[PDB]
Ligand binder design. Structure first.
Ligand SMILES: *[C@@H]1O[C@H](CO)[C@@H](O[C@@H]2O[C@H](CO)[C@@H](O[C@@H]3O[C@H](CO)[C@@H](O)[C@H](O)[C@@H]3O)[C@H](O)[C@H]2NC(C)=O)[C@H](O)[C@H]1NC(C)=O
Ligand SMILES: *[C@@H]1O[C@H](CO)[C@@H](O[C@@H]2O[C@H](CO)[C@@H](O)[C@H](O)[C@H]2NC(C)=O)[C@H](O)[C@H]1NC(C)=O
Ligand SMILES: *[C@@H]1O[C@H](CO)[C@@H](O[C@@H]2O[C@H](CO)[C@@H](O)[C@H](O)[C@H]2NC(C)=O)[C@H](O)[C@H]1NC(C)=O
Ligand SMILES: Nc1ncnc2[nH]cnc12
Ligand SMILES: [Zn+2]
Ligand SMILES: [Zn+2]
Ligand SMILES: [Zn+2]
Length: 256
């Protein structure tokens, strides 16, 4: 996701931390963050070139089908197994279990960003179109690629048009629904029988959404506007809420 999506996910997650995880996050954040995890939830995107080995860790490339399997797909262009967002999440969550050898401030920031990215449908999608990056369309009157529409345009258009430029408005509405509309599902989103995290569950859901909602109905050159926007917005809400709820559930398991 772009900045807004990661901020939303981290804002939701930080208010769902239990006391031991809230304590560990406050201790691991640098002073400049002023205690706010969401002020650094895009840090990982800012080291894609300084730490070039980290670039493939933001997504998963799959064959053209609605299927995801860790052993088949979690590898980078060189074929090195484990170098994809699911493998990164296992890596950095395992490093945080050592909290109170690695920089754990970086592990916390990578886990926060990657838990977000693994919930963007087009970050678990086709290698053949680079996760929709090569599908060129128009978002209303402007040129955009489909990947960027999902990382940024849908959220930005909702923030301006539906929330009158208050992104805290979108956060607040998601938090209200996590409490009043989605409570039973939220309990399932939080459940993980693994030691730490369950990224393969989230990636499987994500390629299914890429097929059914993101790629669906889209052809190079189409103009995506109100019909696509209103029909896809609920899936974006769902994924941002799942990302926030799961990031908190994971950090609570790790630090507890
Ligand atoms: C798990 O997390 C660790 C910590 O961020 C990652 O370690 C980093 O791994 C990369 C290689 O993938 C290392 O870079 C390479 O280093 C060697 C020289 O040491 C150099 O020959 C290569 O050109 C490249 O720069 C990097 O140094 C290393 N960083 C640390 C602090 O250990 C690891 O990649 C992650 N694995 C995942 C997410 O699957
Ligand atoms: C752990 O990693 C973080 C992020 O890479 C380091 O913090 C950065 O430190 C440099 C100076 O070395 C500053 O210019 C950056 O502003 C810092 N980034 C952030 C996000 O705070 C941190 O120093 C590392 N801790 C170590 C080496 O023990
Ligand atoms: C929170 O949930 C409410 C209720 O489901 C959502 O509002 C509904 O949105 C649908 C479109 O998905 C409309 O067709 C209904 O008319 C709305 N219902 C009501 C009572 O207004 C709302 O969009 C959700 N907000 C978030 C951020 O998830
Ligand atoms: N190749 C790729 N596949 C999916 N998402 C991406 N984001 C940046 N590059 C990507
Ligand atoms: Zn992102
Ligand atoms: Zn992206
Ligand atoms: Zn990213």
């Amino acid at each position: 996701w772009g900045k807004e999506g990661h901020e939303i996910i981290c804002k939701i997650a930080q208010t769902r931390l239990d006391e031991t995880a809230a304590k560990a996050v406050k201790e691991l954040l640098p002073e400049s963050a002023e205690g706010d995890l969401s002020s650094l939830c895009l840090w990982a995107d800012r080291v894609k070139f300084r730490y070039h080995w980290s670039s493939p860790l933001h997504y998963i490339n799959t064959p053209d089908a609605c299927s995801y399997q860790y052993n088949r797909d979690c590898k980078d262009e060189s074929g090195e197994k484990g170098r994809c967002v699911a493998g990164a999440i296992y890596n950095y969550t395992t490093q945080l279990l050592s909290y109170k050898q690695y920089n754990l401030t970086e592990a916390l920031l990578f886990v926060s960003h990657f838990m977000g990215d693994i919930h963007q449908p087009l970050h678990v999608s086709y290698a053949s179109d680079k996760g929709g990056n090569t599908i060129e369309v128009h978002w209303y009157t402007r040129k955009a690629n489909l990947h960027h529409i999902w990382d940024s345009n849908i959220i930005e258009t909702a923030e301006a048009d539906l929330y009158n430029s208050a992104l805290e408005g979108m956060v607040d509405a998601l938090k209200k629904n996590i409490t009043t509309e989605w409570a039973d599902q939220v309990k399932r989103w939080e459940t993980c029988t693994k030691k730490t995290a369950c990224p393969d569950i989230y990636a499987s859901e994500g390629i299914q959404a890429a097929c059914d909602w993101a790629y669906k109905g889209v052809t190079e050159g189409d103009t995506l506007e109100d019909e696509y926007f209103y029909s896809r917005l609920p899936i974006v809400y769902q994924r941002l809420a799942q990302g926030g709820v799961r990031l908190a559930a994971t950090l609570n398991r790790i630090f507890g």
